[PDB]
Swiss-Prot record, chain A:
Fluoroacetate binds at R108, R111, H152, W153, Y216. Keywords: Hydrolase. Disulfide bonds: none annotated. This is Fluoroacetate dehalogenase.
């Protein structure tokens, strides 16, 4: 596997729930970058160097993803709930002395991120979420069109071992299919092939696949419940927030992203980026500039 | 290997313009066509058909593309696996037997053929029974988080080929047994005759058969929904006396109370829950068979 972060260090961060792997580079204010599915921290490899000019960039594999440890799950999928992941990453950052930091997340990582901001807003200076709406909003908008678009939300959340068993026949196919299907172009061309290999290798591990399903199971159940509590309580993220989404990404299929995020966040700016779902890889310069601009003031 | 679960039934290969329909035929008296659904074949009627065959000419047919019926070549609109097209094909099959006016009971996909048949060509039916379905429109209209999770396969199997085909190829025996078991009240395969499960497993082991099933579900997401929508919007009602039976633990009762739903679709509907999961004729053959004989005779 290629080193896609030339000059970044590699940290194995102990937490109570297992080690978090991260690449760490740059200097200045701490900025944690979180990837999503079916990716690993290397999806930031085109934007992290630009970020590392201005920030101490921590490019972490989510709990259970990539090279991070995989806490054993349970019937409530607890360690793979975004609430638990957020707590674990808070612990990780505290291990580095970062008790107040900036956070950009994409996909599942963005769900960790906004849940972090809801649960522990004092930990965040600013938050950026890339190509998501809250889990609640996806489920609340789960009509025929959207159930077909993000079928994987309900397929991967089926009880184990159903998705695991189907995924295990040809894991390569499914990870490449998801990478390809959510880009603007509909193929793998946006990705560095070395990055694709990282994703594919992570996906080839049945335990990693199981964790991804647990993530999606949490997404269907506890995460939704946690979000539901907050929306019905009118709890809003008070952390200044950037919502970026792909013009051809997932979030904009569900609804107008900024409208939605304004219901969840008191201080949110937003911009589309001409991109499919994989903003930092499909549109690295535009994503990097948006993030630098936002986190720099 | 494959047991004969209809001793005394003939076996009929019925030619149609779209390919052969396989059917077991028994009994004498008024014709009654029995259509199975997914992921089964005609043998799912093996426990109720003999009781029916005491009063009816019972034609137990494999749906087009299912079981041993021929598989018409599909197209970009999945036309031959739309319920409208399958209904036309089964009408043609019944005409080959000289049955232009017949009784029809369908389960699952077969019940979708059956009510579409009833909407399109109600002059063909004396009486209709649908087992454990609501119209396809109603499932998509009711689509929400709970139903998406419960009938995730409606959106999974409707994904563009070859995604569900490739995934189902990951563990087809597991998948068909998982569907069979998970939709029963027991949660396991104990309600089924092992020889019937073998029929379903063998049909499901064929990749072409699995592709047809996906074509059926693709139709189910697109054209079938559109056809149903036209009828809802035109206020078209099934005018054939109909019986809606559903499993107290079945697929229909979760989304909406089936008789109240079917009354919006049918002018003359009676209904009863059956103490069973989805597979009424196998989980509750006596109760199902009683209801059907009572309704049809």
């Amino acid at each position: 596997l290629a080193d896609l972060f030339p000059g970044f260090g590699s940290e194995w961060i102990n937490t109570s729930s297992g080690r978090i792997f991260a690449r760490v580079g740059g200097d200045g204010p701490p900025l944690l970058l979180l990837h999503g599915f079916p990716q690993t921290h290397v999806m930031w490899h085109r934007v992290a160097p630009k970020l590392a000019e201005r920030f101490k960039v921590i490019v972490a594999d989510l709990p259970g993803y990539g090279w991070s440890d995989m806490p054993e799950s349970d019937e409530q999928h607890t360690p793979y709930t975004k609430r638990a992941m957020a707590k674990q990453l808070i612990e990780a950052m505290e291990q580095l002395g970062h008790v107040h930091f900036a956070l950009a997340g994409h996909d599942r990582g963005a769900r960790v991120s906004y849940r972090l901001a809801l649960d522990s807003p004092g930990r965040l200076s600013k938050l950026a979420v890339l190509d998501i709406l809250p889990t609640y909003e996806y489920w609340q908008r789960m009509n025929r069109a959207y159930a077909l678009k993000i079928y994987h939300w309900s397929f991967l959340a089926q009880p184990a071992p159903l998705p695991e068993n189907l995924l295990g026949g040809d894991p390569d196919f499914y990870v490449k299919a998801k990478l390809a299907s959510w880009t603007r172009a509909g193929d793998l061309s946006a990705f560095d092939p070395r990055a694709v290999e990282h994703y594919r290798i992570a996906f080839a591990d049945p335990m990693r696949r199981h964790v991804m399903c647990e993530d999606y199971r949490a997404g269907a159940y506890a995460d939704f419940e946690h979000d539901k509590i907050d929306v019905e309580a009118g709890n809003k993220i008070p952390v200044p927030m950037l919502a970026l989404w792909g013009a051809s990404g997932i979030a904009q299929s569900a609804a107008t992203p900024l409208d939605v995020w304004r219901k969840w966040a008191s201080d949110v700016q937003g911009a589309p980026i001409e991109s499919g779902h994989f903003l930092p890889e499909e549109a690295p310069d535009q994503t990097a500039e948006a993030l630098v601009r936002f986190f720099s003031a």
